[PDB]
Every structure is written in structure tokens, then in C-alpha cells.
Design a protein around this nucleic acid. Sequence first.
DNA 1: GACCGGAAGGAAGTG
DNA 2: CACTTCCTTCCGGTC
Lengths: 90, 93
Amino acid sequence: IQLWQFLLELLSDSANASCITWEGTNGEFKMTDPDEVARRWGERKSKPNMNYDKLSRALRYYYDKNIMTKVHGKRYAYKFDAHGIAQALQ
Amino acid sequence: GQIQLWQFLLELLSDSANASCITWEGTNGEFKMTDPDEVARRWGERKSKPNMNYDKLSRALRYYYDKNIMTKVHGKRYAYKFDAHGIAQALQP
DNA sequence: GACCGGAAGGAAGTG
DNA sequence: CACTTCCTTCCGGTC
Ligand SMILES: [Ca+2]
Ligand SMILES: [Ca+2]
Ligand SMILES: [Ca+2]
Ligand SMILES: [Ca+2]
Ligand SMILES: [Ca+2]
């Protein structure tokens, strides 16, 4: 499983809004609890030392592939739009 | 296709018309990629692999360390050093 | 503190 | 095989 798949899995269920949520309609999302997202991403890949420094590095590798971009100035905010998902499913 | 990354890099490096994206630096086999995204693109172009980027190219170069084909120029951005002895073995069947 | 991106190397897939 | 792909881990730097 890719990180971008797992994040869309969390974002699709409103019950995870406590740790991660959509914000707008254009694919912008925010991690309301980054440490909780990281902890769950770690539990998924059997990576119990996973944290936000490491998970965000994984997100940063998506910039060059046009898969997502940073919401400049918004704490824990990135953009995963329809262009982005199209690139992820190639 | 068929071609290997170390050959493709030697091809570019031999022609100093490519100096804008990759050139020799020392006299001892050291080279720097002045435009790493451009080197990745052409490598992608060559191998019909259109999602190629420095992250994936540099990972390929990192596999050459244990093959004695090249080494990292430590503390110098996008800089590597070819080994004439390693190139020679890479050349053999 | 976020955020950035270089560099190392593990691990699985490809063709 | 010889990469390709996608990270995980670490870290020095900017802001
Ligand atoms: Ca980049
Ligand atoms: Ca770049
Ligand atoms: Ca500080
Ligand atoms: Ca740090
Ligand atoms: Ca620091």
C-alpha cells in the first residue's frame, strides 16, 4: 500500500476527522493530529517508530511526481487534487 | 533500452556540449550533475520511462557503490566519482 | 517548531 | 539481472 492510498482511506471516512480531514473542495486536506496519522501509518506498514518527520518526507517525495503539493503557510496542510490522483493511478 | 546508466552518463560526459546539465570536475573521474532533473529526464527519455527523476536515478547510482563502478563525492551536491577499474569489469560479459 | 530536500539503503516489482 | 519504484531513516539547513 502507498502512503497516498492510506491517506485517501482516512480522508474518505469522517470518523477520522479527529486526526485528518478535507478542507475546501479542491483536494486540500489538513492533519488535525499529525502524530496520530503517523502512528496509524506506522501500524499499517509494521513500522512502530513512524512519526510526522518521516511521513512528511514521504509526502515531500510526491512534490516532484506532481502527485500532491504543500498548502504554503497552513500547518499540516497539503493538496491532493484530481490531477494529483490521476498521476498516482498511471 | 539495453544501455546501462553508467554508460549513458559516460556518453553525456564525453561530450562537453552537455556541460549545462552534467560535466567532469576533477581529472580523477569526479563529475557533477549541474541540472539533475535534466539528466533524469534524458535517462527517462532513453529507456522509455517517462516518470524518471533524480530520486530514482540517484538510487540506481547508489547500487553502483557495491559494484565498485562509482562512489559519492562526500559533501558535494549531485557529485560522484567513476572508477576506471569498475568501468572495466562492468564492460566484461 | 514546521518545512525542505540530499543522501543512504531496505525491499518488492519489472522486463 | 539492472534497474525501477517507494519508501524509511537520518540530518543539516532555512524560516
Ligand atoms: Ca524536488
Ligand atoms: Ca529539483
Ligand atoms: Ca532551531
Ligand atoms: Ca530536523
Ligand atoms: Ca534541525
